[PDB]
PDB file of C-alpha atoms in Angstrom:
ATOM      1  CA  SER A   1       0.000   0.000   0.000  1.00 64.11           C
ATOM      2  CA  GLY A   2       1.013   3.661  -0.452  1.00 63.44           C
ATOM      3  CA  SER A   3       0.837   4.141   3.349  1.00 66.05           C
ATOM      4  CA  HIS A   4       1.068   2.170   6.606  1.00 65.89           C
ATOM      5  CA  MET A   5      -2.084   0.541   8.032  1.00 61.45           C
ATOM      6  CA  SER A   6      -3.127  -1.911  10.772  1.00 60.59           C
ATOM      7  CA  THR A   7      -2.680  -5.656  10.149  1.00 62.97           C
ATOM      8  CA  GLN A   8      -3.384  -9.209  11.405  1.00 63.09           C
ATOM      9  CA  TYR A   9      -0.133  -9.142  13.449  1.00 63.97           C
ATOM     10  CA  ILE A  10       2.552  -6.986  15.117  1.00 67.38           C
ATOM     11  CA  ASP A  11       5.351  -7.049  12.519  1.00 65.81           C
ATOM     12  CA  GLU A  12       5.603 -10.813  11.697  1.00 67.79           C
ATOM     13  CA  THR A  13       8.771 -10.841  13.865  1.00 65.82           C
ATOM     14  CA  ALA A  14       7.206 -10.713  17.349  1.00 65.95           C
ATOM     15  CA  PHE A  15       8.168 -13.340  19.952  1.00 68.12           C
ATOM     16  CA  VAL A  16       7.505 -14.296  23.593  1.00 67.48           C
ATOM     17  CA  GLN A  17       9.804 -15.425  26.411  1.00 66.24           C
ATOM     18  CA  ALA A  18       9.782 -16.430  30.091  1.00 67.93           C
ATOM     19  CA  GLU A  19       9.048 -13.763  32.725  1.00 66.20           C
ATOM     20  CA  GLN A  20      12.452 -13.883  34.488  1.00 66.97           C
ATOM     21  CA  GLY A  21      13.201 -17.509  35.495  1.00 62.70           C
ATOM     22  CA  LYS A  22      10.155 -19.641  34.555  1.00 64.09           C
ATOM     23  CA  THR A  23      12.441 -21.723  32.278  1.00 64.73           C
ATOM     24  CA  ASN A  24       9.353 -22.306  30.089  1.00 65.65           C
ATOM     25  CA  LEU A  25       6.529 -20.387  28.398  1.00 66.85           C
ATOM     26  CA  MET A  26       4.022 -22.799  29.980  1.00 66.46           C
ATOM     27  CA  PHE A  27       1.829 -20.862  32.416  1.00 63.84           C
ATOM     28  CA  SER A  28       1.579 -21.216  36.211  1.00 62.78           C
ATOM     29  CA  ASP A  29      -2.241 -21.328  35.892  1.00 61.86           C
ATOM     30  CA  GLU A  30      -4.376 -24.153  34.471  1.00 59.18           C
ATOM     31  CA  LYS A  31      -6.575 -21.631  32.618  1.00 60.26           C
ATOM     32  CA  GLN A  32      -3.643 -19.917  30.889  1.00 59.03           C
ATOM     33  CA  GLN A  33      -2.062 -23.254  29.935  1.00 56.17           C
ATOM     34  CA  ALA A  34      -5.269 -24.837  28.570  1.00 54.15           C
ATOM     35  CA  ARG A  35      -6.511 -21.774  26.657  1.00 55.26           C
ATOM     36  CA  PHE A  36      -3.075 -21.488  25.059  1.00 53.85           C
ATOM     37  CA  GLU A  37      -3.404 -24.924  23.429  1.00 54.13           C
ATOM     38  CA  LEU A  38      -6.847 -23.981  22.079  1.00 50.98           C
ATOM     39  CA  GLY A  39      -5.565 -20.686  20.661  1.00 54.52           C
ATOM     40  CA  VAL A  40      -2.628 -22.293  18.822  1.00 52.32           C
ATOM     41  CA  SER A  41      -5.027 -24.885  17.368  1.00 54.42           C
ATOM     42  CA  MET A  42      -7.231 -22.182  15.813  1.00 52.63           C
ATOM     43  CA  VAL A  43      -4.144 -20.587  14.175  1.00 52.79           C
ATOM     44  CA  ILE A  44      -3.232 -23.777  12.284  1.00 50.61           C
ATOM     45  CA  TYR A  45      -6.801 -23.828  10.905  1.00 49.38           C
ATOM     46  CA  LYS A  46      -6.465 -20.389   9.254  1.00 49.90           C
ATOM     47  CA  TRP A  47      -3.328 -21.530   7.378  1.00 49.91           C
ATOM     48  CA  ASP A  48      -3.948 -21.804   3.628  1.00 50.62           C
ATOM     49  CA  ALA A  49      -1.246 -24.322   2.700  1.00 46.45           C
ATOM     50  CA  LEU A  50      -2.694 -26.777   5.252  1.00 46.37           C
ATOM     51  CA  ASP A  51      -6.316 -26.116   4.239  1.00 47.64           C
ATOM     52  CA  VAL A  52      -5.661 -26.982   0.572  1.00 49.14           C
ATOM     53  CA  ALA A  53      -3.527 -30.008   1.521  1.00 49.80           C
ATOM     54  CA  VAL A  54      -6.438 -31.716   3.323  1.00 50.61           C
ATOM     55  CA  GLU A  55      -8.914 -30.700   0.582  1.00 49.26           C
ATOM     56  CA  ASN A  56      -6.795 -31.784  -2.417  1.00 53.47           C
ATOM     57  CA  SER A  57      -5.551 -34.804  -0.403  1.00 49.95           C
ATOM     58  CA  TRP A  58      -1.831 -34.301  -1.100  1.00 50.37           C
ATOM     59  CA  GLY A  59      -1.324 -37.296   1.245  1.00 47.84           C
ATOM     60  CA  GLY A  60      -3.254 -40.248   2.697  1.00 46.35           C
ATOM     61  CA  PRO A  61      -6.988 -40.359   3.552  1.00 44.75           C
ATOM     62  CA  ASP A  62      -5.957 -39.434   7.120  1.00 42.48           C
ATOM     63  CA  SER A  63      -5.184 -35.868   5.961  1.00 44.91           C
ATOM     64  CA  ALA A  64      -8.069 -34.600   8.131  1.00 45.01           C
ATOM     65  CA  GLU A  65      -6.388 -36.192  11.181  1.00 48.29           C
ATOM     66  CA  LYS A  66      -2.786 -35.088  10.452  1.00 48.40           C
ATOM     67  CA  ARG A  67      -3.756 -31.422  10.996  1.00 45.44           C
ATOM     68  CA  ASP A  68      -4.286 -32.254  14.702  1.00 46.04           C
ATOM     69  CA  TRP A  69      -0.549 -32.931  15.143  1.00 44.46           C
ATOM     70  CA  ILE A  70       0.622 -29.683  13.507  1.00 43.94           C
ATOM     71  CA  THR A  71      -0.681 -27.687  16.504  1.00 44.44           C
ATOM     72  CA  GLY A  72       0.791 -30.176  19.016  1.00 47.33           C
ATOM     73  CA  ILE A  73       4.395 -29.700  17.859  1.00 46.46           C
ATOM     74  CA  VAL A  74       3.950 -25.897  17.904  1.00 43.54           C
ATOM     75  CA  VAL A  75       2.837 -26.005  21.565  1.00 43.73           C
ATOM     76  CA  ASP A  76       5.840 -28.294  22.166  1.00 43.35           C
ATOM     77  CA  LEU A  77       8.175 -25.317  21.611  1.00 43.65           C
ATOM     78  CA  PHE A  78       6.638 -23.500  24.591  1.00 40.68           C
ATOM     79  CA  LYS A  79       7.213 -26.382  27.040  1.00 43.79           C
ATOM     80  CA  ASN A  80      10.818 -27.152  25.957  1.00 43.58           C
ATOM     81  CA  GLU A  81      12.256 -23.612  25.598  1.00 42.92           C
ATOM     82  CA  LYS A  82      12.272 -20.366  27.611  1.00 46.97           C
ATOM     83  CA  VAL A  83      11.551 -18.313  24.459  1.00 48.57           C
ATOM     84  CA  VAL A  84       9.845 -18.845  21.077  1.00 47.58           C
ATOM     85  CA  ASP A  85       9.570 -16.513  18.067  1.00 45.53           C
ATOM     86  CA  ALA A  86       7.738 -16.426  14.730  1.00 42.60           C
ATOM     87  CA  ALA A  87      11.011 -17.427  13.008  1.00 44.46           C
ATOM     88  CA  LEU A  88      11.528 -20.956  14.402  1.00 46.11           C
ATOM     89  CA  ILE A  89       7.768 -21.620  14.245  1.00 47.08           C
ATOM     90  CA  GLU A  90       7.779 -20.913  10.483  1.00 47.38           C
ATOM     91  CA  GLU A  91      10.160 -23.794   9.721  1.00 47.23           C
ATOM     92  CA  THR A  92       8.289 -26.107  12.131  1.00 50.19           C
ATOM     93  CA  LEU A  93       5.014 -25.502  10.248  1.00 47.87           C
ATOM     94  CA  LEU A  94       6.700 -26.142   6.882  1.00 52.00           C
ATOM     95  CA  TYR A  95       8.649 -29.245   7.918  1.00 52.30           C
ATOM     96  CA  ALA A  96       5.648 -30.820   9.652  1.00 53.72           C
ATOM     97  CA  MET A  97       3.360 -30.610   6.605  1.00 54.21           C
ATOM     98  CA  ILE A  98       6.210 -31.682   4.288  1.00 52.93           C
ATOM     99  CA  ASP A  99       6.417 -34.871   6.360  1.00 56.44           C
ATOM    100  CA  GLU A 100       2.691 -35.553   5.749  1.00 58.61           C
ATOM    101  CA  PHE A 101       1.952 -33.846   2.389  1.00 60.11           C
ATOM    102  CA  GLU A 102       5.366 -33.503   0.662  1.00 61.82           C
ATOM    103  CA  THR A 103       4.283 -30.001  -0.441  1.00 64.54           C
ATOM    104  CA  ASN A 104       7.788 -28.470  -0.114  1.00 66.85           C
ATOM    105  CA  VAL A 105       5.765 -25.207   0.240  1.00 66.50           C
ATOM    106  CA  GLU A 106       7.643 -21.936  -0.388  1.00 66.66           C
ATOM    107  CA  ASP A 107       4.624 -19.594  -0.712  1.00 66.25           C
ATOM    108  CA  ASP A 108       5.527 -17.821   2.567  1.00 68.13           C
ATOM    109  CA  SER A 109       2.000 -18.635   3.789  1.00 69.75           C
ATOM    110  CA  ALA A 110       3.404 -19.750   7.182  1.00 69.70           C
ATOM    111  CA  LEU A 111       4.812 -16.291   8.060  1.00 71.07           C
ATOM    112  CA  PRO A 112       1.498 -14.672   9.181  1.00 72.03           C
ATOM    113  CA  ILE A 113       0.608 -18.008  10.836  1.00 71.60           C
ATOM    114  CA  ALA A 114       3.825 -18.212  12.870  1.00 75.53           C
ATOM    115  CA  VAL A 115       3.281 -14.779  14.432  1.00 75.92           C
ATOM    116  CA  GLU A 116      -0.373 -15.604  15.106  1.00 73.21           C
ATOM    117  CA  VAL A 117       0.872 -18.401  17.393  1.00 75.97           C
ATOM    118  CA  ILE A 118       2.895 -15.769  19.293  1.00 75.18           C
ATOM    119  CA  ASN A 119      -0.258 -13.679  19.837  1.00 73.46           C
ATOM    120  CA  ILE A 120      -1.955 -16.544  21.714  1.00 73.28           C
ATOM    121  CA  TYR A 121       0.628 -16.355  24.513  1.00 72.78           C
ATOM    122  CA  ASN A 122       0.017 -12.644  25.084  1.00 74.12           C
ATOM    123  CA  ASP A 123      -3.778 -13.165  24.943  1.00 72.28           C
ATOM    124  CA  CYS A 124      -3.432 -15.800  27.688  1.00 75.43           C
ATOM    125  CA  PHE A 125      -1.260 -13.406  29.749  1.00 74.96           C
ATOM    126  CA  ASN A 126      -3.801 -10.590  30.230  1.00 78.20           C
ATOM    127  CA  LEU A 127      -6.729 -13.018  30.759  1.00 78.29           C
ATOM    128  CA  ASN A 128      -8.658 -11.043  28.114  1.00 75.85           C
ATOM    129  CA  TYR A 129      -8.766 -14.211  25.956  1.00 73.48           C
ATOM    130  CA  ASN A 130     -10.141 -12.129  23.064  1.00 71.06           C
ATOM    131  CA  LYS A 131      -8.308 -13.981  20.265  1.00 70.04           C
ATOM    132  CA  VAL A 132      -8.761 -17.593  21.419  1.00 68.02           C
ATOM    133  CA  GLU A 133     -12.466 -16.989  22.158  1.00 67.47           C
ATOM    134  CA  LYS A 134     -13.395 -15.461  18.789  1.00 65.69           C
ATOM    135  CA  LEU A 135     -11.432 -17.881  16.587  1.00 65.78           C
ATOM    136  CA  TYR A 136     -13.179 -20.801  18.306  1.00 68.08           C
ATOM    137  CA  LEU A 137     -16.562 -19.531  17.071  1.00 69.82           C
ATOM    138  CA  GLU A 138     -15.400 -18.538  13.578  1.00 69.03           C
ATOM    139  CA  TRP A 139     -13.935 -22.066  13.267  1.00 72.90           C
ATOM    140  CA  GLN A 140     -17.261 -23.901  13.702  1.00 72.44           C
ATOM    141  CA  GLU A 141     -18.422 -22.833  10.226  1.00 70.78           C
ATOM    142  CA  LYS A 142     -15.122 -23.958   8.645  1.00 71.79           C
ATOM    143  CA  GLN A 143     -15.877 -27.622   9.421  1.00 68.77           C
ATOM    144  CA  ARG A 144     -19.705 -27.852   9.326  1.00 70.94           C
ATOM    145  CA  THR A 145     -19.802 -26.675   5.687  1.00 72.56           C
ATOM    146  CA  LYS A 146     -16.155 -26.136   4.623  1.00 70.07           C
ATOM    147  CA  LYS A 147     -16.761 -22.366   4.346  1.00 70.20           C
ATOM    148  CA  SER A 148     -13.757 -20.225   3.385  1.00 68.46           C
ATOM    149  CA  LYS A 149     -12.861 -16.647   2.379  1.00 68.77           C
ATOM    150  CA  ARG A 150      -9.826 -14.790   0.973  1.00 66.43           C
ATOM    151  CA  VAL A 151     -10.080 -11.896   3.487  1.00 65.77           C
ATOM    152  CA  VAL A 152      -7.717 -13.857   5.771  1.00 68.41           C
ATOM    153  CA  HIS A 153      -4.896 -12.482   3.588  1.00 68.38           C
ATOM    154  CA  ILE A 154      -2.869  -9.354   4.409  1.00 65.67           C
ATOM    155  CA  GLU A 155      -4.215  -5.938   3.339  1.00 66.06           C
ATOM    156  CA  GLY A 156      -1.218  -5.618   0.962  1.00 66.08           C
TER     157      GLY A 156
END
């Protein structure tokens, strides 16, 4: 665009880290830890390269079940490291779907998805839960009728 405007993320380079000595990004509260796994799950569902891989069946008939593991390995970064950023999540999204769809994807579609995973941690930190709550409702229509729209893309 000819001028700066608001967007779906901070700057696609945001990250999150432990408070001071937590040694992990996993929360001290059961509500913050559980809502974080739900929020990361909804971010893998807005990813285009995954959505077309299960619809065109680039892999086995279990393609609708493989998408449940792509969110699990992303949450696994938060329980094994004291910091995670949108940069090491990007390669984890790519390599995980390459191992189940052989897409070799290079469309950069994982960049806005990787930073969306970072936003879930900050939404669980202020107990506002605004992002995990809304995506859970907007997701129900994506599976009951396979509804989709191109407005998920950046404003350019």
